[PDB]
Structure 1
Amino acid sequence: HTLVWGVWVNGVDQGDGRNIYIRSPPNNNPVKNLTSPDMTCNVDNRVVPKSVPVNAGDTLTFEWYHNTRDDDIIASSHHGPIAVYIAPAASNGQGNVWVKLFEDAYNVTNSTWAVDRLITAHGQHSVVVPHVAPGDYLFRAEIIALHEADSLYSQNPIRGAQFYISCAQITINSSDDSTPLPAGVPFPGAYTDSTPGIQFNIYTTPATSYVAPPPSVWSGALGGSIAQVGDASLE
């Protein structure tokens, strides 16, 4: 149970974005139904009044929280991967539009899931803004909690993989468009009951065997991190 508070751009806090530049849902409950329209941008997908200005190559940091800013972030039980997707904003996230910029699942070197590292990072994970065409975009940050993922939601709706989905409105101003954005995958649709990484038993199946759900990270993606960029306590 977690939500995005706001973003940072090059380590500069853009301020509380809830219902402002984040298409915030009404609460931190997960999406679980893989065929739900709620898979696109969570349960209240609509245009919010602001879009955060960035340039290609900026570091864009998403900041998550549980109940209040810079708290426990997400229950420690919620082990799983983190991904970030991008889509042109005029799509409203509909159709074959979502391109993956970032994936972090289980780190064999550190013996830690992305969610574990997100807590350590005070809720912060980042991407490099890609060199796509200037314009308005949706950045879809997705945490998958796998602590009840041994079941399919379609077999037992009390369980299932949990999707914490947050869409940020980002305007890319300066970009040389060296990597034009291709078509991508649909949400809902990309993840099905048979997709690798959706049904996974963390109690019985070693995390070293986990394969995150496709799609693969796009060749145009420039990378990212799970690391604290900014200190909310100094504000």
Structure 2
Amino acid sequence: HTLVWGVWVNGVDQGDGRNIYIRSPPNNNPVKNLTSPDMTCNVDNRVVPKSVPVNAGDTLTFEWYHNTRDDDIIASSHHGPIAVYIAPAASNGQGNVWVKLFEDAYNVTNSTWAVDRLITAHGQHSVVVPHVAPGDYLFRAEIIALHEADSLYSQNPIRGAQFYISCAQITINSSDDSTPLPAGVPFPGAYTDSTPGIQFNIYTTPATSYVAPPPSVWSGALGGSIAQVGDASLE
């Protein structure tokens, strides 16, 4: 159970984004139904009043929390990967529009899932804003918690992969548009019962054999990290 508080741009807190520039759901409950429209931007997908301005090459940091800002972030049980996708805002997240900018599943060196490193990072993970056309975009941050993913939700609705999905409204002001955004995947629809990384037993299978769901990261993406950029306790 986890939610996005807001974003930072180049290490500068943009302030409380909840129902302002984040299409916030009412609570921190997971989505589990792979075919539901809730897979797009969670259960309350509507236009919110503001869009954070960035430029191509800026560092955009998402900040997650559990109950209050900079708390335990997410329960330690919730091992799993983190991805970030982008789509043109005009789409409203419908159609074949989502392009993957970032993927982190399991780091063999540190023996940590992306979620474990997100806790250590005070809920902060970043992407570098790609060189797409100037305009309005939705950035979709997705955590998959795998602690009950040995079962499929479609077969047993009390278990299944848990999806924590947040969509931020971002406006790209300056960009040279050197990497125009290609077509992407649909949410719902990219993930099915047979997609790799949706059904997995973290208790009995070694993390080193985990494969994150496709699509692969777009070659136009400029990277990202799971790492604290700012200290929320100074604001």
Distance 2:38 2:145 in 1: 16
Question: C-alpha separation between the residues in 2 aligned to 1:233 and 1:46?
Answer: 30
Distance 1:234 1:193 in 2: 44
State how 1:201-216 maps to structure 2 within 5 Å.
201-216=201-216
State the alpha-carbon separation in 1 of the partners of residues 64 and 107 from structure 2. Answer: 20
3-state SS of paired residue (2:144): strand
How far did 1:109 drift?
A: 1.0
Q: 3-state SS of the aligned residue for 2:61?
A: strand
Over aligned residues, Cα RMSD in angstroms?
0.3
TM-score norm. by structure 2 comes to 1.00
Q: Percent identity?
A: 100
Partner of 1:40: helix, strand, or coil? helix
Alignment pair present for 1:77 and 2:77: yes
Scaled by the length of structure 1, the TM-score of the pair is 1.00
Q: CA deviation at 1:140?
A: 0.0
Q: For 1:10-31, what per-residue CA distance to the aligned partner results, in whole angstroms no more than 9, with x for missing partners?
A: 0000000000000000000000
Q: Distance in 1 between matches of 2:11 and 2:132?
A: 22
SS of residue in 1 equivalent to 2:64:
strand
Cα offset for 1:234?
1.1
Equivalent-residue separation in structure 1 for 2:88 and 2:32 (angstroms): 25
| Structure 2 unaligned blocks of 5 or more | none
Distance 2:136 2:223 in 1: 20
| CA distance in structure 2 between the aligned counterparts of 1:25 and 1:234, rounded to whole angstroms | 27
Please list the CA deviations of residues 169-211 of structure 1 after superposition, one character each: whole Å capped at 9, or x if unmatched.
0000000000000000000000000000000000111101000
Question: Residue 101 of structure 1: CA displacement?
Answer: 0.1
1:59-105 CA-to-partner distances (Å, cap 9, x unmatched) read: 00000000000000000000000000000000000000000000000
Aligned to 1:20: 20
Structure 2 distance, partners of 1:58, 1:209, is 34
1:141 aligns to what?
141
1:102, 1:76 → 2: CA distance?
A: 22
Would you say how many aligned residue pairs link Structure 1 and Structure 2?
235
SS of the residue 1:117 aligns to: helix
1:13-64 per-position Cα deviation (integer Å, ceiling 9, x unaligned): 0000000000000000000000000000000000000000000000000000
Q: How does 1:93-132 map to 2 (within 5 A)?
A: 93-132=93-132
**Distance of 1:44 and 1:90 partners within structure 2:** 17
**Equivalent in the alignment of 2:168:** 168
Distance 2:219 2:185 in 1: 15
Q: Does the residue aligned with 2:115 lie in a helix, a strand or coil?
A: helix
Query: Whole-Å Cα distance in 2 between the matches of residues 187 and 110 of structure 1?
Result: 31
Q: Deviations over 1:136-167 (max 9, x none)?
A: 00000000000000000001001000000000
- Once residues 37 and 178 of structure 2 are traced to their aligned partners in structure 1, the CA distance between those partners, rounded to angstroms, is 32
SS in 1 for 2:208: helix
Give distance in 2, aligned partners of 1:173 and 1:113. 34
Partner of 2:16: helix, strand, or coil?
A: coil
SS in 1 for 2:137: strand
Equivalent in the alignment of 1:231: 231
SS in 2 for 1:62: strand
Deviation at 1:226, TM superposition (A): 0.1
SS, match of residue 7 in structure 1: strand
